Amino acid sequence: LGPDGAFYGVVSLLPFQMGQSGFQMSLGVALTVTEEGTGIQVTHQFFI
Amino acid sequence: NVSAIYTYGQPVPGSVTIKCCREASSYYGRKGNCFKGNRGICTNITGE
Ligand SMILES: *[C@@H]1O[C@H](CO)[C@@H](O)[C@H](O)[C@H]1NC(C)=O
Ligand SMILES: *[C@@H]1O[C@H](CO)[C@@H](O)[C@H](O)[C@H]1NC(C)=O
């Protein structure tokens, strides 16, 4: 990113086994943002 | 462990191909369980 701060993260669910018994009813998603110069990162996790 | 023989006891040169697979669960579909399993992952090998 960089124009103004934005990212459109489309994720394909085809590799995920949607339609079977490998379900836990929960999809854990973690999102981490870093910076070019500083090695600092910010992490944000949640359950869909 | 496959073999093949003529009527009078003769070897048979040729191609022997084996294909093995099945269905996954076939719940019923629609008002039951619409999308389920796959077409069944079918594998295939051939030999001489
Ligand atoms: C964010 O806003 C809407 C809702 O998801 C979407 O249509 C739009 O494309 C998104 N914008 C970006 C820059 O990802
Ligand atoms: C096995 O047979 C199927 C028939 O649809 C074919 O598509 C597949 O390529 C065959 N296996 C190999 C290794 O070629």
Cα(B7)–Cα(A26) distance, integer angstroms: 61
User: DSSP for B2-45?
Assistant: ---B-TTS-B--S-EEEEE---------TTTTSS-S-S---EEE
Residue A19 to residue B36, Cβ atoms within 8 A: yes
Query: Ligand 1 centre from A7 Cα, in Å?
Result: 8
A8 Cα: distance to centroid of ligand 1 (angstroms): 6
Alpha-carbon distance of A16 to A29, in angstroms, equals 13
- What was the experiment behind these coordinates? cryo-EM
**A18: which chain B residues are within 8 Å (Cβ-Cβ)?**
35
Retrieve residue A33's tokens: 């943002």
Q: Which residue of A has its CA nearest to B24?
A: A20
CA distances from B34 to A47, B31, B39 (A): 25, 7, 14
Resolution in A: 4.1
Buried b (16+ CB within 10 A) or exposed e, B16-37: eeeeeeeeeeeeeeeeeeeebb
- Residue type for position A12: S
